[PDB]
Design a protein around this ligand. Structure first.
Ligand code: NA
Length: 129
């Protein structure tokens, strides 16, 4: 599923991501924009052989099981495929664990490089929330 900007902002708000660990909803929408272009089916292979999955490009090194990332963990206790669902519940629940891990949203390199410190409220501007 390719979400619309305001459609995804509403789905993230409904699942409790708005101001989760102090990160306003525009932060999460901005991260999803640059990670996946709002596509739940986004995948990216890393040089290390891990894979990033879904709207927030969650990695198999730590967070999900894909059966093909040697030495990895599955801290969200999900198959990585769950992160590609049209239903963002697995992505959001796992993002909550990631952003609680110590480095906040820096865990998402695209958030640090493209969202951090910018006017992230522009990502929810005009959305009925
Ligand atoms: Na894994």
């Amino acid at each position: 599923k390719v979400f619309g900007r305001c459609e995804l902002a509403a789905a993230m708000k409904r699942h409790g991501l708005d101001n989760y660990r102090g990160y306003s909803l525009g932060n999460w929408v901005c991260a999803a924009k640059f990670e996946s272009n709002f596509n739940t089916q986004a995948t990216n292979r890393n040089t290390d052989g891990s894979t990033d999955y879904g709207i927030l490009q969650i990695n198999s090194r730590w967070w999900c099981n894909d059966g093909r990332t040697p030495g990895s963990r599955n801290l969200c206790n999900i198959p990585c495929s769950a992160l590609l669902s049209s239903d963002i519940t697995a992505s959001v629940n796992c993002a909550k664990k990631i952003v609680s891990d110590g480095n906040g949203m820096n865990a998402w390199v695209a958030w640090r490089n493209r969202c951090k410190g910018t006017d992230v409220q522009a990502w929810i501007r005009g959305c009925r929330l």
